Design a protein around this ligand. Structure first.
Ligand code: CLA
Ligand code: CLA
Ligand code: CLA
Ligand code: CLA
Ligand code: CLA
Ligand code: CLA
Ligand code: CLA
Ligand code: CLA
Ligand SMILES: CC1=C(/C=C/C(C)=C/C=C/C(C)=C/C=C/C=C(C)/C=C/C=C(C)/C=C/C2=C(C)CCCC2(C)C)C(C)(C)CCC1
Ligand SMILES: CC1=C(/C=C/C(C)=C/C=C/C(C)=C\C=C\C=C(C)\C=C\C=C(C)\C=C\C2=C(C)CCCC2(C)C)C(C)(C)CCC1
Ligand code: SF4
Ligand code: SF4
Lengths: 172, 69, 80, 33, 733, 43, 94, 154
């Protein structure tokens, strides 16, 4: 229950929150309002990245599209998404801003509170992992311009002790 | 009261007066005028002089605050 | 002419007025200090503004204080 | 006449307008009501 | 108030002669005038602004009228590269016949003065190809001056008298000024450039009698309403255009081809048209921001009370700042002069590099006079911005109404700011003077290979980041594979590259170690002027030596010899010494400019690149060398056209030395001297009949300071104007 | 003498001693290592 | 050709739909929160400026949400803007 | 070869500066006998100049079109001998000066009249401190972490 066991946990996050490991070394979540907004935005970023990563490796495993016109698809995108995002902005209850439930929770996963807390922990963990995975996709596409993520995993599994990150991180 | 009203003789004190040279600087109370009608009884003696080459000045009780040391 | 003011931080040392070369100041009785006297400035019309008074005020910043203001022939110190 | 207009206006301006201006302004200085 | 100062009965009740000076000098300090209000303050300011606009239009009308009447503009239009501009004729009856013979230039039948203001180029670039055009413009500007005068008269009358609640309407005013005064104004300027200036460049003259008939583009407004705006950029004057005739012209009115016109070495009129149009869209959109009588928009008060960062770094944020700015005219004036000085320096830095007027790059005295002008103007405007911020911190700053806010938290760490600006100036002056002196010595020891020459790698990187291949960094525009080069590959970069790489023009000059060192001298000057001004502004309310300085005002002489001495303690005196350092800084800027440019124009850039790295090069190869044709303006055997510039040079030297009198000598020696003089006059027979009315006195300390600075700055300015104009006119490279 | 050393430790006497020693140091360095613009060791 | 009369009406109707239906409550919320442009703690009209007088007559709309003529100008200014942006950026082959 | 500057080991104008200074010093050398003190000193200055130019050549200095070494400060590893290594060499000494001075002022701060120790410099105290600035980059770092570098307002 700590990102680095030994560091003093700050006073404003201590384990009660769903995904609390005491990782605020810069002191961004000092005040409570910014902290609440941050966990909202964290859950949203997490859910978008977890929507993204299976939309990357699945096209790459079969389609090999490499995840790479404007004035119509852009307009339909903005129209479809701004509506949902502002309707999300129109909620004021914070625990319902993070976890609305109701018309968003079918299958009755939110029926038991203890499993709800455990599943919130699961969501936030898998989501931080997926945010890291997307940042990995982006920087691996920046370093290697024309390679896929699963392609890079094959590159690693071929000779892992010779094809790794080191080639880019140091000049030699 | 006939007993002392202000800091002790020798109590290193801080100045909260914004117009003094030794503002937010420590001092050394050398005397406190026990007359309960003077406005600035606290005679302080600082270490470094002001621009007028003076190391002492009278201060009030509310324009002064003793340090934890 | 000039506006001389004496604030309540005065210790009544009588240097402000013993330095003042134009009889602007005068010590009066008071109950705010151990010396039981404070300086007053009745004859501000005779005030030239030389600030010898406040070059001799031994306080935190000052108790006597000269404010430069409407300059007349006697505040400008003219024999003509 | 256009070549003769500076000869009328420069002695007019740079000498009379100082006469008029400095005189009237000295009178405005030395006034009492 | 009984005597001449009707606005201060403290100076009217002054039998001396200080009242005349202080009634001149405080005439325009309305918020210090006696027995006035805020209504009368704002209304006098409004009428004063009307008078300023009247004077501005009158002065422009005088320029136009004298160029039309006494000028050679119709001759300048034909052969501009080889016909000299003419500001105005001269009728000085002190002239001798050699001087009448020497000052006859530009094909005139009498003496004349050469327009080193560039008004010829800018009028010729915007149409105006006859003297009658300039006459109509001058008459219309005279009408506009009379319009401003009657407006400022009637807005003082009680019927038309705006209340303070109208002046403080900082949202309607902002919306209107943005939208109209910038957006519609630049839009109207485009509507001139498209209808007049470009057709006047493309040939045909489009005037008031025929501007409704002439289509600015062969397909009028179909392309605009139908969205096909690309039809306005079809024939963009394809590189063979002669400014003022249809040869090699086109039909476009709005382009983004960038770069320079090849004939004029100036910017394209179509680029200026599209530019003013685009920024018109931006300003007309931005002027619909602030809340007004129509229910929508922003309240700047809540914009400021909302920009308070959680975390308490800024503390109370911008809370209470709308009320402390809108009520404080000095804060508005300080911010205004800040922005104005920065954009004035921008005008200079972009008119020298990106000249927007025909045949102003190839003429060389106007391009220097304008830069020097606007940069000294910017330095003065900046000193005034800070001085008015100081006057705000004294007069108009309420510490309780803005407690712990960005402004209050600012005054807290004034010692930190002052100390770190002191550090920056001290570091820069120490090091860069040390390097200039090291190089002076290394030349004085015949070892120029030992000099500290730091190549300005960062400015050269920015240059190579814009298309200059003179260094070989090949980054973001000199690299063909860079996406920034690929984006604007088809829009502007051909013209911009054949402009910036062309080593004849003056944008993005090839810089070297002397440029590094003088840029650091410039940084020293800016940081130091800033230090002086910021320190005066933040210690304006008080310090440890004089904590009740707000009670004495902004301008007061001193606080006496007590407390060690308090000469030049007021924020006014900070402004004072900052004007000195500002003149010094702008002198460095303009010396750098003029030497780099005169060496470029002459052709020997090596002169600057070798001699600018050691100060004796500036004293020899810039001042001593370029002052050769000036001081010989009138020798014991004859004179030439540069006689006036030599006389002005020495005149400026004279007043610049006279200022040292009022600065070095102070008040007391002169009062005693005047006492002796008064004795002598009152006891001298036949002059005892004459007795003064104002008792004579030596000048007050703050006054004589101001007078010394006036003489000092007048001499600085007139001397350098004489030198710059004469050096660039004695040769024109 | 104690007072002679007290005077030798005064700010100007000690300053000129310190700067004479320092100046001799830099002088002998610029004679033994003259004409130096770049630090070539591990360059 | 993008039919310059169809894209412009389309984008304008789009901006009006995004105004009234999607976020007018957000815009009116921010209007009521930012409030009038007060000076010294009071509105300009409440300070003596007779010329401010926020025009309730122009704002008195009986559209059941309150979409006044000024909001129609607002959403439609943005509409014509985005329309001509699309049209111009689509005109040239860049 | 960066910033459009040729190295001085392969520059023409740099060698021209060399030849010109050598001819200048030789023109002042044909006025004395080749064994006297002036001619010997001139020959020593000549060898000094020649070795100077050759050392500026061999260090990889960059000589521009004017033929003088233009120092590179950007941080290029080849040109750390221009600014960064002597910059560290400076800052080490400068912080030595500051740190021994600061520890001296703190040492005399607990004196009855400290100012007399700023006039009459306590040479034993300073000399015991004069080498304590050798370790300033670590002592100052700890005083910053412990809170002893920066004072507290009270
Ligand atoms: C943008 C995504 C995002 C956001 C908004 C948050 C927000 C939060 N995280 Mg999470 N987190 C994220 C991504 C994010 N995280 C990722 C990707 C990881 C894995 C690397 C983690 C791992 C993590 C742990 C282990 C813990 C948190 C915790 C927290 C909370 C307290 C710390 C804080 O105030 O940070 C606010 C953060 C921001 C406002 C983001 C600022 C980003 C800066 C500007 C740039 C970063 C650049 C970076 C170097 C390169 C990428 C807060 C709710 C703690 C908690 O209680 O969870 C509820 C906790 O224990 N986070
Ligand atoms: C502020 C603008 C301005 C400035 C600085 C000048 C400057 C000058 N003018 Mg011009 N002038 C101007 C506006 C201006 N003029 C306007 C608007 C008019 C039309 C009414 C004139 C009509 C005019 C004439 C007819 C003459 C001058 C002349 C002169 C010169 C001597 C001063 C004089 O007698 O002027 C007089 C100007 C006025 C009374 C107009 C003030 C409004 C001087 C170079 C004289 C000249 O040519 O000397 C070389 C001359 O003969 N001016
Ligand atoms: C004895 C020396 C002397 C004098 C008196 C003059 C006089 C004159 N010269 Mg100059 N000149 C001289 C030497 C002199 N010259 C020399 C040696 C040269 C070099 C060869 C020249 C070169 C020269 C040129 C090239 C020109 C002149 C011009 C002029 C005329 C300017 C018109 C005017 O009325 O200005 C009025 C005064 C001013 C504009 C000065 C403004 C600043 C004042 C001091 C501030 C005013 C204060 C306040 C705001 C107003 C209150 C009222 C005030 C009256 C008190 C004027 C007749 C010009 C000319 O002929 O045009 C008509 C012109 O173009 N002269
Ligand atoms: C759209 C309506 C509108 C317009 C056009 C104006 C116009 C103006 N107002 Mg405003 N005003 C308005 C509405 C408007 N007002 C409203 C509703 C209020 C209600 C409170 C006010 C209250 C108000 C006050 C209180 C004051 C003004 C003032 C002014 C004048 C400013 C001074 C000036 O001319 O510089 C104009 C400057 C520019 C157009 C451009 C400056 C900066 C550019 C970006 C520089 C770069 C380009 C440069 C110009 C190129 C030059 C090249 C070459 C041609 C030389 C100007 C005439 C002042 C004035 O003079 O009083 C009459 C003044 O004191 N106004
Ligand atoms: C405030 C600025 C302004 C003003 C008052 C006008 C006014 C006018 N324009 Mg111009 N115009 C302007 C800006 C302006 N225009 C700009 C910025 C452009 C470029 C986008 C044009 C491009 C333009 C064209 C192409 C045509 C006009 C035309 C016209 C006239 C009839 C328009 C109905 C009218 C005189 C028409 C005319 O015949 O004149 C015409 O065909 N205008
Ligand atoms: C938009 C421009 C602008 C405006 C509106 C003002 C307006 C004002 N200034 Mg500011 N000022 C400005 C620019 C401006 N100044 C610039 C550019 C500087 C830098 C030089 C200053 C430096 C400055 C100082 C240092 C002081 C003022 C003061 C004043 C006030 C009285 C001025 C007066 O009556 O003197 C009239 C002046 C003269 C008759 C002669 C001046 C001498 C020169 C040589 C004439 C040209 C007035 C509110 C004073 C003030 O507010 O008092 C507290 C004050 O102390 N100003
Ligand atoms: C050449 C003239 C000159 C010079 C050198 C300076 C220098 C300075 N002025 Mg300016 N100043 C000047 C003219 C000058 N001023 C004038 C005419 C005025 C109008 C009154 C002002 C008004 C003014 C104000 C109002 C302010 C300054 C400030 C400063 C300091 C800026 C920090 C800096 O760059 O210092 C770097 C150091 C130097 C430039 C000193 C050069 C000398 C060398 C380095 C000393 C070493 C040589 C040698 C070994 C010593 C022994 C000599 C001998 C005994 C043997 C600096 C001391 C500002 C300040 O204090 O900021 C910190 C400030 O607020 N000055
Ligand atoms: C601030 C600006 C400035 C700068 C940067 C320089 C820089 C330089 N000048 Mg110039 N100079 C300047 C101002 C400046 N000068 C001024 C104002 C003058 C007029 C007084 C001169 C006059 C001048 C002359 C006449 C000469 C120079 C020379 C030099 C060079 C000196 C190299 C040298 O001998 O150091 C070598 C290093 C030292 C002397 C310091 C040694 C420090 C000791 C040994 C302690 C370090 C060791 C320590 C124990 C730590 C080791 C690590 C470990 C134990 C921890 C250098 C390029 C000389 C040169 O060769 O020009 C190129 C030369 O001939 N200069
Ligand atoms: C005293 C005072 C005052 C006055 C002051 C002043 C006068 C100031 C000034 C100031 C200034 C004068 C400032 C300036 C600034 C600047 C800046 C801050 C800049 C920025 C920039 C940027 C950010 C950029 C960007 C970019 C680039 C780089 C280029 C290209 C484009 C882009 C955009 C990208 C007042 C009244 C206020 C108040 C009181 C106090
Ligand atoms: C790399 C480099 C560069 C750059 C750099 C930079 C940009 C830096 C920055 C830096 C910074 C931004 C810094 C800051 C700081 C701050 C602070 C705040 C500090 C403090 C300190 C202290 C406090 C100390 C003290 C001391 C010492 C330790 C010494 C002596 C003594 C004393 C006590 C003085 C370049 C490229 C140009 C060149 C090359 C090199
Ligand atoms: S000098 Fe000052 S303290 Fe002394 S008597 Fe006068 S006012 Fe009082
Ligand atoms: S300023 Fe001079 S005259 Fe006035 S009270 Fe002080 S000492 Fe007396």
């Amino acid at each position: 229950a700590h990102w680095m066991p030994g560091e003093p946990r700050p006073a404003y996050l201590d384990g009660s929150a769903p995904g609390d490991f005491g990782f605020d070394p810069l002191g961004l979540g000092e005040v409570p309002a910014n902290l609440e907004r941050y966990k909202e935005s964290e859950l949203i970023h997490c859910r978008w990245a977890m929507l993204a990563v299976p939309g990357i490796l699945v096209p790459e495993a079969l389609g090999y599209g490499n995840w790479v016109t404007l004035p119509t698809i852009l307009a339909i995108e903005f129209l479809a998404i701004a509506f949902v995002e502002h309707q999300r902005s129109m909620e004021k209850d914070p625990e319902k801003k993070k976890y609305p439930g109701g018309a968003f929770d079918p299958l009755g996963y939110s029926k038991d509170p203890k499993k709800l807390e455990e599943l919130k922990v699961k969501e936030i963990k898998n989501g931080r992992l997926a945010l890291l995975a997307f940042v990995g996709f982006c920087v691996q596409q920046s370093a290697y311009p024309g390679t896929g993520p699963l392609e890079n995993l094959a590159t690693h599994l071929a000779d892992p002790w010779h094809n790794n990150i080191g080639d880019i991180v140091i000049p030699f | 009261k006939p007993p002392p009203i202000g800091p002790k003789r020798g109590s290193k004190v801080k100045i909260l007066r914004r117009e003094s040279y030794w503002f937010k600087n420590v001092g050394s109370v050398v005397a406190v005028d026990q007359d309960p009608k003077t406005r600035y009884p606290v005679v302080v003696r600082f270490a470094k002089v002001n621009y007028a080459n003076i190391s002492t000045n009278n201060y009030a009780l509310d324009e002064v605050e003793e340090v934890a040391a | 002419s000039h506006s001389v003011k004496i604030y309540d931080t005065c210790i009544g040392c009588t240097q402000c007025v013993r330095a003042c070369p134009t009889d602007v100041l005068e010590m009066i009785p008071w109950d705010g200090c151990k010396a039981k006297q404070i300086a007053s400035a009745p004859r501000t019309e005779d005030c030239v503004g030389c600030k010898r008074c406040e070059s001799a005020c031994p306080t935190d910043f000052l108790s006597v204080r000269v404010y430069l203001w409407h300059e007349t022939t006697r505040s400008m110190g003219l024999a003509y | 006449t256009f070549n003769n207009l500076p000869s009328i206006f420069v002695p007019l301006v740079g000498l009379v307008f100082p006469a008029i201006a400095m005189a009237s302004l000295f009178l405005h200085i030395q006034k009492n009501k | 108030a009984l005597r001449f100062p009707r606005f201060s009965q403290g100076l009217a009740q002054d039998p001396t002669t200080r009242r005349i000076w202080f009634g001149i000098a405080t005439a325009h300090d309305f918020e210090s005038h006696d027995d006035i209000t805020e209504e009368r303050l704002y209304q006098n300011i409004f009428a004063s602004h009307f008078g300023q606009l009247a004077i501005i239009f009158l002065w422009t009308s005088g320029n136009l009228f004298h160029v039309a009447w006494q000028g050679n503009f119709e001759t300048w239009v034909q052969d501009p590269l080889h016909v000299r501009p003419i500001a105005h004729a001269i009728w000085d009856p002190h002239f001798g016949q050699p001087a009448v013979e020497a000052f006859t230039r530009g094909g005139a039948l009498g003496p004349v003065n050469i327009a080193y203001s560039g008004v010829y180029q800018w009028w010729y670039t915007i149409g105006l190809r006859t003297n009658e055009d300039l006459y109509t413009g001058a008459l219309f500007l005279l009408f506009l001056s009379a319009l401003s005068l009657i407006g400022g008269w009637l807005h003082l009358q009680p019927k038309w008298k705006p209340r303070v609640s109208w002046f403080k309407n900082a949202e309607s005013r902002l919306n209107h000024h943005l939208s109209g005064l910038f957006g519609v104004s630049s839009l109207a300027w485009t509507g001139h450039l498209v209808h007049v200036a470009i057709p006047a460049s493309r040939g045909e003259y489009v005037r008031w009698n025929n501007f409704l008939n002439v289509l600015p583009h062969p397909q009028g407004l179909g392309p605009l309403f139908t969205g096909q705006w690309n039809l306005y950029a079809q024939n963009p004057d394809s590189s063979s255009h002669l400014f003022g005739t249809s040869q090699g012209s086109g039909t476009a009115i709005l382009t983004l081809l960038g770069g320079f016109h090849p004939q004029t070495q100036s910017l394209w009129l179509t680029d200026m048209a599209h530019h003013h149009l685009a920024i018109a869209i931006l300003f007309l959109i931005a002027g619909h921001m602030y809340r007004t009588n129509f229910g929508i928009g922003h309240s700047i008060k809540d914009l400021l009370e909302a920009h308070i960062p959680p975390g308490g770094r800024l503390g109370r944020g911008h809370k209470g700042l709308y009320d402390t700015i809108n009520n404080s005219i000095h804060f508005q004036l300080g911010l205004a002069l800040a922005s104005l000085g920065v954009i004035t320096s921008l005008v200079a830095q972009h008119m020298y590099s990106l000249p927007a007027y025909a045949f102003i790059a190839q003429d060389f005295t106007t391009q220097a006079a304008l830069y020097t002008h606007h940069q000294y103007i910017a330095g003065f405007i900046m000193t005034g911005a800070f001085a008015h911020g100081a006057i705000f911190f004294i007069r108009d700053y309420n510490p309780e109404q803005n407690e712990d806010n960005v402004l209050a938290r600012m005054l807290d760490h004034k010692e930190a700011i002052i100390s770190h600006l002191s550090w920056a100036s001290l570091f820069l002056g120490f090091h860069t003077l040390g390097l200039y002196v090291h190089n002076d010595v290394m030349l004085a020891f015949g070892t120029p290979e030992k000099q500290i020459l730091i190549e300005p790698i960062f400015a050269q990187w920015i240059q190579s980041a814009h298309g200059k291949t003179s260094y070989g960094f090949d980054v973001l525009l000199s690299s063909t594979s860079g996406p920034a080069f690929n984006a604007g590959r088809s829009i502007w970069l051909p013209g911009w590259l054949n402009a910036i790489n062309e080593n004849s023009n003056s944008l993005f000059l090839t810089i070297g170690p002397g440029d590094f060192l003088v840029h650091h001298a410039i940084a020293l000057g800016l940081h130091t002027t800033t230090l002086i001004l910021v320190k005066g502004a933040l210690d304006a309310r008080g310090s440890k030596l004089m904590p009740d300085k707000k009670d004495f005002g902004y301008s007061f002489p001193c606080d006496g010899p007590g407390r060690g001495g308090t000469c030049d303690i007021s924020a006014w005196d900070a402004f004072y010494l900052a004007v000195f350092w500002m003149l010094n800084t702008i002198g460095w800027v303009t010396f750098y400019w003029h030497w780099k440019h005169i060496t470029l124009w002459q052709g020997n850039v090596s002169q600057f690149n070798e001699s600018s790295t050691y100060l004796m090069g500036w004293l020899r190869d810039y001042l001593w060398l370029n002052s050769s044709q000036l001081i010989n303006g009138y020798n014991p055997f004859g004179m030439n056209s540069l006689s006036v510039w030599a006389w002005m040079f020495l005149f400026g030297h004279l007043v610049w030395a006279t200022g040292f009198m009022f600065l070095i000598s102070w008040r007391g020696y002169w009062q005693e001297l005047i006492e002796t003089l008064a004795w002598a006059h009152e006891r001298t027979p036949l002059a005892n009949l004459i007795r003064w009315k104002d008792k004579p006195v030596a000048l007050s300390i703050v006054q004589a300071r101001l007078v010394g600075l006036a003489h000092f700055s007048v001499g600085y300015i007139f001397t350098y104007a004489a030198f710059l104009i004469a050096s660039t006119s004695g040769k024109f490279g | 003498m104690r007072d002679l050393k007290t005077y030798l430790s005064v700010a100007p006497v000690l300053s000129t001693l310190w700067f004479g020693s320092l100046a001799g140091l830099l002088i002998e360095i610029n004679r033994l290592f003259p004409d130096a613009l770049t630090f070539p060791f591990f360059s | 050709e993008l039919s310059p009369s169809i894209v412009i009406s389309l984008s304008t109707g789009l901006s009006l739909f995004l105004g009234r239906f999607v976020f007018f409550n957000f815009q009116r919320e921010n209007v009521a929160k930012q409030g009038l442009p007060e000076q010294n703690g009071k509105t300009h009209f409440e300070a003596g400026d007779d010329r401010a007088k926020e025009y309730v007559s122009l704002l008195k709309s009986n559209d059941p949400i309150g979409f006044n003529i000024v909001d129609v100008l607002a959403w439609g200014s943005i509409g014509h803007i985005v329309a001509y942006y699309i049209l111009a950026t689509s005109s040239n082959g860049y | 070869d960066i910033s459009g500057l040729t190295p001085c080991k392969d520059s023409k104008q740099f060698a021209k500066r060399e030849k010109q200074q050598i001819k200048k010093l030789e023109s002042s050398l044909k006025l004395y006998a080749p064994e006297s003190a002036p001619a010997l000193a001139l020959n020593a200055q000549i060898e000094k100049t020649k070795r100077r130019f050759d050392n500026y050549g061999k260090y990889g200095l960059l000589c521009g079109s004017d033929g003088l070494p233009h120092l590179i400060v950007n941080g290029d590893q080849r040109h750390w001998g221009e600014f960064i290594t002597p910059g560290i060499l400076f800052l080490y000494i400068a912080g030595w000066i500051g740190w021994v001075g600061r520890s001296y002022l703190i040492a005399i701060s607990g004196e009855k009249k400290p100012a007399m120790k700023e006039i009459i410099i306590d040479v034993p105290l300073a000399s015991r401190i004069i080498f304590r600035g050798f370790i300033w980059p670590v002592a100052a770092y700890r005083e910053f972490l412990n809170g002893d570098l920066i004072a507290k307002d009270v």
